[PDB]
Each structure stands twice: as C-alpha cells, then as structure tokens.
From a paper:
Here, we investigate the molecular origins of the nearly billionfold rate enhancement achieved by directed evolution of the computationally designed Kemp eliminase [name] (7). The Kemp elimination is a well-studied model for proton transfer from carbon that has served as a benchmark for de novo design. All [name] variants have an inactive conformational sub-state, rooted in the original protein scaffold, which was gradually supplanted with a catalytically competent sub-state as evolution progressed.
Cryogenic structures of [name] and [name].7 in the absence of a ligand revealed that β-strands 6 and 7 (located adjacent to the binding pocket), adopt two distinct backbone conformations whereas only a single conformer is observed for [name].17. Estimating the respective populations from the volumes of duplicated cross peaks shows that the inactive species comprises ~25% of the [name] and [name].7 samples at 25 °C, but only 5% of [name].17. Because the sparsely populated inactive sub-state of [name].17 was not detected in the cryogenic X-ray structure, we set up crystal screens under conditions favoring this conformation (pH 10 and 37 °C). Taken together, these data show that: (i) the [name] variants all exhibit a slow, pre-existing equilibrium between active and inactive conformational sub-states; (ii) the last 10 rounds of directed evolution ([name].7→G3.17) substantially reduced the population of inactive species present under ambient conditions; and (iii) moving away from the conditions employed for selection (i.e., higher temperatures or pH) increases the fraction of enzyme in the inactive state.
Residue numbers in the entry: 4 to 302
The structure:
Amino acid sequence: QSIDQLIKARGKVYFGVATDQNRLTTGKNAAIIKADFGMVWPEESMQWDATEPSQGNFNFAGADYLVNWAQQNGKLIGAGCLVWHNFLPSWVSSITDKNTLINVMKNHITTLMTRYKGKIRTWDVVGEAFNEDGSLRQNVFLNVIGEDYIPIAFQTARAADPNAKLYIMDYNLDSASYPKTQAIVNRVKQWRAAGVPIDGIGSQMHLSAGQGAGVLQALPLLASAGTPEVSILMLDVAGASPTDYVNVVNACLNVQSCVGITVMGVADPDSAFASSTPLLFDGNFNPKPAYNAIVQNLQ
C-alpha cells in the first residue's frame, strides 16, 4: 500500500522522497516513487553549484529532468536549497561585500524560482542558518550581508513565485529542549513580525535510533512560530526502527500545520548512510518493517 495515498487519506498533503535524474534512470526507484510517494525533491540538481557554477551562467539539466519527470508522473515538487553553505561554489563564498552578495543571491533565487514558476509546491529558501547553540551560522551570507540576508532572500523568493510555499529548514530541531529548536522558533516569530514571508519551517530529520520520540514535542514547538506550515524533510533513521518512524509519523499527524513528510531516499543501498539501513525500502527495493508499520499506522 502507498504511504502517500494513506497519508493523504488522513488529510495531509504528501509523503515525499528526495531523488534526482541519476536515481530515476536506474534500479527500481522510479517504479517505487510512482507507486508509493506523492512528492519529489531534487537531492542535488537544484543546489547552487549545479545550477549556477559561475556568476550569471545557469544550467538546469538535472533540475529540468526532475521537474519534468514529476509533471509527467503526477507528482508534487519541492525544491531547494536556494541559500545555504552546502553545495555553495567558491565564487560565491569568495564574495566580500554586501551589495554584491545580495545581488548574486537575489539573482540566484529569482532565476531558479522563475524558471519553474507556478509548478513548485515548496522552495527551501534558506537552509541550515543556525548554529547548534541557536546563534546564526556564520556562512558567507551572514558574514557579508548580515542578518538581513534572510529577510531579503524570502522577499525575493515571494516575488519570484508567489504560489510557492517558502521555507526555512534546519537539522537537529528534534528536541523541544534543544537551544537550536527554540532559537529558530524565536527568530522565525520575530522575522514574521518583521514581514519576512516565511511560510514554513522544514525539519531536516536525519535521526539516530531512538530520536523519533523527541519529535513528538519538537514538532509542535516548531509549529508555534506561527508559520502557516511545517514539514519533515530529509527523513531517515539509523536502523529504521518501526518505532522511530511511527513516532515521526504521529508527530506529523498530531501537528495540524504539518503538511507532510519527505524521506531522504527510497532504498537503503542508495542512501549516503546505506550501512545504517535508514530508509523504508531495502536493497532489493522491498518494503521494510518500518514501511509496513507506517502503512499500519495510517490505515
């Protein structure tokens, strides 16, 4: 049974998965995504190095493949990350001055979002903006633009595609008692009061065994920032315990504003963390106990 169909039958928007052209042309990925998932996200093909390897020179080969595949196959699309330190070319982090970096950042946001305007559900506009203590991460954007980079990024994104949900995302937001979780909430509330159009907080849930339980209170904390939505993305769990995965699903179900859950991949051997068998399908692309437990929890 399809966990996407089942979660939609509980009133959520999707059960999604990260993928890309390289996965869709091989193995059983495409067949499983077609059958069991309702939203796809590009793992890497929309990241900065892939789409803008030098200033103003864009390419969309991978991104177009994924967006077109989704459309061809009736799947929702989320995309990102527009502004974060990962996949960031040195040409960008070598920028030393505020206005240059603002204009580079705006042009990157605008170009990517405009290309797919109206067809993308969610854009991860800003990612991994926080340190573990809740201060803002000293990536090149914070270092050079200052804290206004987050307001600017979101306002630019809203202009580029007003139909898209605009998210901030971070990891280690998995306990309500962790300073990072508290800080993103406080800062998002503030930013929204300042008119920054942050529609969602996305919790990048790369979890170790036993961490699912903490999400039951972390997720409503994230939802208390007042964004219209929250979501779970990049979900995987070391060991793929049914208990961890069911806890995450229940947190989603318990949080009105939580629209859905995206897993970081389909089958364990293709995970960057393959040896931790942290996904819902095994190396033979068969559903794992955790997949069945999610089915049972959503029936």
